[PDB]
Amino acid sequence: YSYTEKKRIRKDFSKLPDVMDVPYLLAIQLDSYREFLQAGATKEQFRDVGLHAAFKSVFPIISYSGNAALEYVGYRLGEPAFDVKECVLRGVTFAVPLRVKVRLIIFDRESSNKAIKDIKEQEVYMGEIPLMTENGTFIINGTERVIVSQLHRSPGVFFDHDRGKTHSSGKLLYSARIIPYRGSWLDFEFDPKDCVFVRIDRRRKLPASVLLRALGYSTEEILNAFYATNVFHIKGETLNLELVPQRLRGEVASIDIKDGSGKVIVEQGRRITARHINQLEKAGVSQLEVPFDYLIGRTIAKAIVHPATGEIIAECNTELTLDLLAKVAKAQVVRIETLYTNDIDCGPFISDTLKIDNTSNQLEALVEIYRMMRPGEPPTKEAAETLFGNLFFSAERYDLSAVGRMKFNRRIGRTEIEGPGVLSKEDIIDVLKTLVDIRNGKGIVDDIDHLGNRRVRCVGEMAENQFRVGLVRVERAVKERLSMAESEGLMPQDLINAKPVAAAIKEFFGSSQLSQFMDQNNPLSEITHKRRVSALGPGGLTRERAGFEVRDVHPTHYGRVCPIETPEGPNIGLINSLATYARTNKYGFLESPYRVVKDSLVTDEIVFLSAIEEADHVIAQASATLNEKGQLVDELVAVRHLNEFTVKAPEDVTLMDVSPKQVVSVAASLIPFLEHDDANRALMGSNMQRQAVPTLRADKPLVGTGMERNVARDSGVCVVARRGGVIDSVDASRVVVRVADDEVETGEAGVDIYNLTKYTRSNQNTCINQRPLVSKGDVVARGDILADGPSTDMGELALGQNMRVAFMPWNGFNFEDSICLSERVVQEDRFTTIHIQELTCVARDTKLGPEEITADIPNVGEAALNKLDEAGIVYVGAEVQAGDILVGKVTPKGETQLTPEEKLLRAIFGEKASDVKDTSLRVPTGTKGTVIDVQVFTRDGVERDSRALSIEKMQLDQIRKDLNEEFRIVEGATFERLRAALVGAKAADDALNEQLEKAQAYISDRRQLLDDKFEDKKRKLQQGDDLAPGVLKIVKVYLAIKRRIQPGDKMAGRHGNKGVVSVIMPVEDMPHDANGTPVDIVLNPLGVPSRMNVGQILETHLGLAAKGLGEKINRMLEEQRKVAELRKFLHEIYNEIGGREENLDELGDNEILALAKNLRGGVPMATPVFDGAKEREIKAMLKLADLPESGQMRLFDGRTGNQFERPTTVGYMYMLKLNHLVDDKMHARSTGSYSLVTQQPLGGKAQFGGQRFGEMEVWALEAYGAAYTLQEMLTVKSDDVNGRTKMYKNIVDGDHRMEAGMPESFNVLIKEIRSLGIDIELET
C-alpha cells in the first residue's frame, strides 16, 4: 500500500473489478521519440527503426560519369550543456550534439578492385537533436512546445460517389484519386459523359488516351481489352452469332433464330419472357440464324482489316451498314470483331474517350503530356520522357510504404502479398477496370470515413520526414565537391556540411502548425493537449475542404477516440482526443484492448484488436451480469458485429470490453455521473474543466471518479520519488530522501536531491509551485508523491473549490445563468489566484547614439526615482503602481527643433534642455503587483552595471552553499557505514585498512566531481548569451498580481453550466437552514428541465452526504472517543452498500487518527463514469449522516426572515474558475493614435483598442429613423482630419455644432481612381 493512500481513502462505487489498470497516458509521446532519437545504448546490433533507418540511405550514393561512395557505421549522441532548469531561465534551446562517422570510398569506375582508397574519420556535428524531457515536451528558446499527432489518410486506392446537387445526376462516378506516402497524387475523375479524364494536383485535366499511351500499350489493344467480349464468324449461312442467354434476358427479339437442327429458340415479333430462358439452357447451343438487316444498329470494336486487299475495309467505331457488308463478303473475312454492348450490360467507356485529341499513337501523347508539366517551354523528346516517366519508373519521390502495396491490392483482388513500390504497367490496369465495375452497380464504394482508411501519425514519424529532407540536400553538395577537387587534399570535416541539417530542423519546429504552444494553465490541460489527434496540418484537409464527411462520429471509433471531447467553434469534428485505453500499434493504427471470452470460462489474457480486424468477430459490452462462475448469465447481451449496435445471443460471443471508461477520453472521464448528462453538455463540460485556473488553496472534490489520481501521477509536475527510503530533511526549497539497502548500488548508496520549483511563470501567465507534503522520518516507497503541483491536493487532481450550493431563484439575480455569490467566498480568500506577468526591455543600437540603461531620467522627480536604484533597475519586491518607472532606458536624439513656446517654459522653471528622449519601460494601466525577480542579459564585449553584479553573486553563492551542504550529507552517509566495523570491539585487521583508504578516496573523488562542476558552472555565469543582432542588453522583470474574484468573472462546474457572477451579497442575506449555515452559491433550478444535465442534482445530493459524514467524524474526534468507536463507524461507511475496500491494516492509534483528521472536512466519494452509484446507494448515505431522505430541506429567508413554503435542494457542488476575468476584457477609449493612409484608430498607445463598426450595425441604424447618428459614426468619429479636431473644440466650448467634414475613406478612393486613367469629378 502506498504511503499517500493511508492518509486519505476514497470509497469506490464500482460494481465490477478491473482486470487491467490504466496504462501510461503519455506513452504515445514517449514511445514515439525513443525510436527517433535512439538514446538507448545496447551491446548488440539494434534495429533502431526511425532516424537511424533514414540515415542509412545517405552514404550509398551513385554519381554519373564518376566513382564516389560513402560508408556510415553509426552516430553518437552527446550530452546537453544546459540543464532542464537553466534552459528555461536564460534564452537557449534544449539540444544535444549529434556526431556521425562517414567513411569516404573512392573508386575508379572500372568494375575492378584496384586503386581504391578509404579514409575513416568522424564527421562534424550534423545539427542538434531536440532530446525532449520525460514529460513529453521539449524546450525551444526557453518556451515549452509540444507536437500533436497527425491524422492523414492511409496509402491506397479509394472509390467514392460524391453525390452532390451540382452534378444534376443520381449516379455519377467520383474521382478515384490515390494518395501515396510521398510525392504528387493522380486525380482520375470519370466524366459524366461516360469518359475518363485524369488530372494532376496542380495541372489541368488530361484525356485517358494520352495517359494510356505513355505506359507503352497501344490505344487499340487497350480499348479492345475491356470490350469486345463476343466474336463473329462467317460460316454456314454466311453468319454465325454466339448465343448467350444473358444478353437476351429481358429484351425483345426481332430476329428469328431458325438454327439448332430444327429446334427453334424464338420467333419474330415475340417478347422474351422467363419461359424462353429455360429452352435455351437445356440444350447448350451456341449458334443461331441472324438476318443481315439486324446488324444495322451494331458497331464494330476495332479496325477490321483484311489480308487480301491490304487496306482497312472497316475502321474502328463504325456501324455495320448494307454497302459495307458487300465489301467484307468479297474480301473473305475470317472473324468479325463486334463489341457486344447492350443496356443490360455494364458498357465500355474507353471507346468514348479514345478519340480525344486524336491520341491514336504514343507520339501524340508525348507532346501533349509535356505542356502541363512545363508551361511555355519548348517540347522535346527527352524532356517529355523524363517528366512522364518520373511517376512510373524514375520514381524520385514516389515511394510507397510496405502496407500500401497490400492495401491497394486487397480492393481489386490479388494473390501476391507484397509487390513493387512504384506503379508498373500491370499494376495500373487494375484501377482502370475496377472503376467501370462500380459504375454499373457491381460492388460498393470505398469507406473513407472509417478508421481503416485513416492513419494516426506521431511525433517521431513527423520529425523523420522533416529530417530526411534536410539531410538529402546536405549530401548533394558533398558528392559534387568531392569529384571536382582532389581527394588527398580534402578532408571529411570540410567535405561535410552541417548547415542544411541544423537549419531545416530548427525552422521546422517553429513554423509548423503541429508544433503549437503548450498550455500550462492546468495540469489536466497538459495531459489532454499531448493526447490529441489532429487532422489538419502539413498535408491534411482544411476547415472548408473537409466538409461534413469527417465532422460525424462513426461506430468504428469505439474505444479509440472520444465522441464527447471535441472543441466547438470554427473547427468541430476535425480534431479529437484519444481514448484512455487506446494504444498505438506498430503500423500506427489505433488499437483498443479487449477481453476474449469463450463458452467455458472467461480468459485472463488481454488481446489488442485493430480497426479492420473487428468486422470478423463479435464484441460485447462490459455491462453484463455474471453468476460468479465465469460465464454469461444474462439471457441477452448487446453486441455489435457489422459495426452496428444490436442484440445478440450469449452463446456465440467472442470478445468483451475491459472497462466502460475506455470510450471516453481523459478530460471526459473525470465528470461524475456522465451517464445522467446529455452529450451536448458532456461536450461543453470537457472544455470548461480544461480551462480551470489553480486557486490559492487546493480543495479536494468530495464527488470524484477515481481517475483523478492517474492524471496527476504520470505528469511531470509533481515530485515523484524515484527510489525508496526514509526522508532525511523536509524544506520548502528542496527535499532529500535516503536509499534503502535492498535497492542500492555498491558506492554512493544514498544520493537523492529533489529541488522543488518556486513560483515561476507558465505559458498562460499563471503561477506554478510545489509544496512538500511529507514529514521527517517517513517510510517512502518507490512511486510515491512528495510534493503536489498547481491545483493538486495530496496527489489528487483538485482544480476548483467546492462549497454549499442551493437551487432557488433568489430575487432574479440568477436570471438565466448568473451566479449569486456570498461574502464568505471572498473573505476566506478562496478563488484568489496568482498571475505572473513578465515585461522585457531591449537596448536598440542606432546611428544617432547607443542606448544604455542609466539612472538619471529627464523631466522626473524624487518620487519617481525613490524606488529605483543607482543603476536604473527596480528593486526586488518593490510595490509598483500603474504608471511607475521599472527600467531606466534613455534614447539619445538630435535636431529636436523646439518651438519658441516650449523654450519660454524651459527658462522659467529652470529645466535644462535635455537632448535625449526618455523611452523607459512603464507598466500599463490597471496592472499592479510586486516584482519577484529581475533577470538581465549581456552580450560579449559590453560593459555591465552594478545591478548585474548582485545577480551573478547570488547565483554563485547559491551554487556554492548548496553544493557544500549536499557534500556533508554524503560524507556522513559514508562514515556511518565504516563505523559498523566494531565487531572486534578493541575499545581482519588488513580488511579495515583497505576500507578506510577506500572511504577516504571516495570522499576525495567526490570532491573532484564538484570542483570540475563548480568551475563549469562559474563559466556559465561569466559568458554572455547569444541574442539577436541589434540588442545590446535585455533586462526582463516579472510581476506578481493577485486577481481576487469580483462581479463579472466566469464560474462553471463540471457538468457544463457557465455563469457570470452578479453581486456579492452579505452573510445576513444568504438563505440559512434551521441550524444556521448560510449557503454560498445560489444557482437557478430552471436549467434542469431545459438542459438535460441531471448530474448537477446527483452530485449536489452526494455532496451533502459527503460533508455530513465528515462533520460527524469531526464531532466524534473532538469528543475524546476511543479507538474502537472510530474504526467501527468508519467500517459502516466503506462497506455498507458496496465497493472494494480493505480494512484491518492500519495502525492502532497512529494511522487511525491520521485518517480521521483528514476526513474531518468531508469524506470523498468515488463515483465512476458508467459504474456509478444507483439511487439506493445514494439515498442510503443521507440516512447515515442524519440528513433528510429526499435531500430537500426548507430554508429560512435571510432578509425578510420568514420561512419558504417549499423544500429547497441544498448540498455541496464542485465549482471551477475560468480564465475569462473582466480585467482582460473591459476597456474604453475616446481619443488615440491613427494610421498613416487610413485615418482609423488603433492600438499602440497602451491605452485601449477601438471596436469595429461593421455593416451589420449599419443596417440596424438605417432601420430606425436615424440620419445624424449614422452620419456621425462614419465622418466625425472616424476617417477625418479637420472634422475630428474641430469637433473636440465644440465639446469643450459647450455647443455641439456638428461640422460636416469629409470622410477620409472616400478621399483615398478618388486619388486611387484618378491614377488608373479613369476620370471622376463632382458636378454639384
Residues in 1069-1088 that interact with other proteins by CB under 8 A: 1071, 1084-1088
Residues 524-543 that bind other proteins (CB under 8 A): none
Q: In DSSP terms, which residues pair with 608 in a beta bridge?
A: 593
Bridge partners of 145?
A: 138, 517
Q: Is 64 in the site for other proteins (CB under 8 A)?
A: no
Name the minimum Å distance from CB 1018 to other proteins: 24
Among 1206, 1246, 1300, 1321, interactor with other proteins by CB under 8 A: 1206
Q: After which residues is the chain broken (C to N over 2.5 A)?
A: 987
Give the CA distances from residue 202 to residues 195, 849, 1042, 1180, in Å, rounded to whole numbers and listed in that order: 21, 53, 56, 69
Q: Which is nearer to other proteins, 526 or 565 (CB)?
A: 565
d(CA 456, CA 588): 6
Count of CA atoms in the C-beta half-sphere (13 A) of 1063: 11
Q: Applying CB under 8 A, does 1192 fall inside the site for other proteins?
A: yes
Q: Which amino acid is at 309?
A: T
Contact in structure between 1002 and 747 (CB atoms under 8 Å) = yes
Under the criterion CB under 8 A, does residue 585 sit at the interface with other proteins?
Answer: no
1296 contributes a contact to other proteins by CB under 8 A: yes
Cα dihedral: 526, 531, 537, 543 (round 10):
-90
Residue 1062 contacts residue 1047 (beta carbons within 8 Å): yes
Query: What are the residue ranges of helices labelled H in 430-522?
Result: 430-440, 459-472, 474-484, 492-495, 499-506
Cα 1027 off chain centre by: 31
With CB under 8 A as the contact rule, the residue among 445, 466, 1197, 1286 that binds other proteins is 1197
Residue from the set 41, 907, 1124, 1228 that interacts with other proteins by CB under 8 A:
1228
Site for other proteins in 737-756 (CB under 8 A): none
Q: Which is nearer to other proteins, 677 or 1080 (CB)?
A: 677
Nearest to other proteins of 532, 1101 (CB atom): 1101
Number of residues that bind other proteins (CB under 8 A): 184
- Closest distance of CB 250 from other proteins, Å: 22
For residue 909, state whether it binds other proteins (rule: CB under 8 A): no
Q: Is 249 near other proteins (CB under 8 A)?
A: no
> Looking at 137, 240, 566, 580, which residue binds other proteins (CB under 8 A)?
566
Q: Is 737 helix (H, G, I), strand (E, B) or coil?
A: strand
Pairwise CA distance, residues 1216 & 524, whole Å: 13
Indicate if the alpha-carbon torsion angle 358, 362, 367, 368 is positive or negative.
positive
Instruction: Please list every residue from 1260 through 1279 that binds other proteins, using CB under 8 A.
Output: 1260-1261, 1263-1269, 1272-1274, 1276-1279
User: Does position 106 bind other proteins by CB under 8 A?
Assistant: no
Q: Which of residues 313-372 bind other proteins (CB under 8 A)?
A: none
CA 236 distance to own-chain centroid: 76
Kindly state whether residue 492 participates in binding other proteins, applying the rule CB under 8 A: yes
Kindly state whether residue 420 participates in binding other proteins, applying the rule CB under 8 A.
no
Exposed, middle or buried: residue 1130 (CB in 10 Å: 0-12, 13-18, 19+)? buried
- C-beta of 755 vs 881, nearer to other proteins: 881
Instruction: Please choose, out of 259-267, 644-652, 781-789, 1123-1131, the segment that lies near other proteins by the rule CB under 8 A.
Output: 644-652
Count of CB atoms situated within 10 Å of the CB of 253: 18
Identify the CA nearest to 1051 among candidates 1198, 1211, 1169, 1213: 1213
How far is the C-alpha of 400 from the C-alpha of 420, rounded, in Å?
9
Per CB under 8 A, the list member of 276, 473, 499, 1018 interacting with other proteins is: 499
Pairing label, strands 1059-1065, 819-822 = parallel
Single residue of 622, 959, 973, 1153 touching other proteins by CB under 8 A = 622
In angstroms, how far apart are the furthest CA atoms of the chain?
Answer: 137
As measured in angstroms, the least distance from the Cβ of 1263 to other proteins is 4
Which range in 253-261, 333-341, 697-705, 1250-1258 contacts other proteins by CB under 8 A?
1250-1258
Contact string (CB under 8 A) for other proteins, positions 4-43, x = contact: ----------------------------------------
Q: How far is the CB of 1323 from other proteins (least distance, A)?
A: 21
Of 1293, 1319, 1321, 1323, which one interacts with other proteins (CB under 8 A)? 1293
Q: How far is the CB of 551 from other proteins (least distance, A)?
A: 5
Binding of residue 108 to other proteins (CB under 8 A): no
> Which residue's C-alpha cell is 491614377?
1315
928: amino acid identity, one letter: K
Site residues for other proteins, 863-902, by CB under 8 A, read none
SS3 call for 680: helix
Out of 84, 283, 367, 1092, point to the residue binding other proteins (CB under 8 A).
1092
Say whether residue 394 binds other proteins (CB under 8 A). Answer: no
- Residue closer to other proteins by CB (options 446, 1272) is 1272
Residue 1144 binds other proteins, judged by CB under 8 A: no
- Of 122-130, 302-310, 768-776, 867-875, the window that binds other proteins (rule: CB under 8 A) is 122-130
Report CA-CA distances (Å) from 177 to 153, 186, 446, 919: 12, 6, 12, 60
Residue 642, CA distances (Å) to 617, 645, 659, 1203 in order: 9, 8, 22, 60
Among 78, 91, 650, 1232, binds other proteins (CB under 8 A): 1232
Beta carbon nearer to other proteins, 281 or 416: 416
Residue from 203, 551, 617, 893 that binds other proteins (CB under 8 A)? Answer: 551
Strand partners, 231: 337
Of 1000-1039, binders to other proteins (CB under 8 A) are 1029-1030
Q: 810, 814, 769, 716: which is closest to 1059 by C-alpha? A: 814
Cell of 695: 486557486
d(CA 337, CA 325): 13
**Selection from 217, 237, 219 nearest residue 227 by Cα:** 219
Q: How far is the CB of 71 from other proteins (least distance, A)?
A: 6
Contact between 648 and other proteins (CB under 8 A)? Answer: no
Q: Does 1175 bind other proteins (CB under 8 A)?
A: yes
Residues 6+ apart with CB under 8 A from 838: 761, 1036, 1037, 1038, 1039
Return the exposure string of 425-456: e unless at least 16 CB atoms fall within 10 Å of the residue's CB, then b: eebebbbbebbbebbeeeeeebbeebbbbbbb
Position 573 contacts other proteins (CB under 8 A): yes
Alpha carbon distance 227, 219 (integer Å)? 13
- What is the rounded distance in angstroms from the CA atom of residue 809 to the CA atom of residue 829? 26
Smallest gap from Cβ 224 to other proteins, in A, equals 37
Nearest residue (CB) to other proteins, 243 versus 536: 536
- Stretch touching other proteins by CB under 8 A, among 297-305, 379-387, 977-985, 1044-1052: 1044-1052
In whole angstroms, how close is the CB of 72 to other proteins at the nearest point? Answer: 8
Residue 1226 Cβ, how far from other proteins at the closest point, in Å? 4
> Considering beta carbons, is residue 302 or 1033 the nearer one to other proteins?
1033
Write out the three cell numbers for 159. 472509390
Q: Is residue 1172 a contact residue for other proteins (CB under 8 A)? A: yes
Smallest distance from other proteins to CB 1252, Å: 3
1208 touches other proteins by CB under 8 A: yes
Q: Rule CB under 8 A: is residue 861 a binding residue for other proteins?
A: no
837 binds other proteins (CB under 8 A): no
Stretch 683-742 residues interacting with other proteins (CB under 8 A): 683
By the rule CB under 8 A, 1316 interacts with other proteins: yes
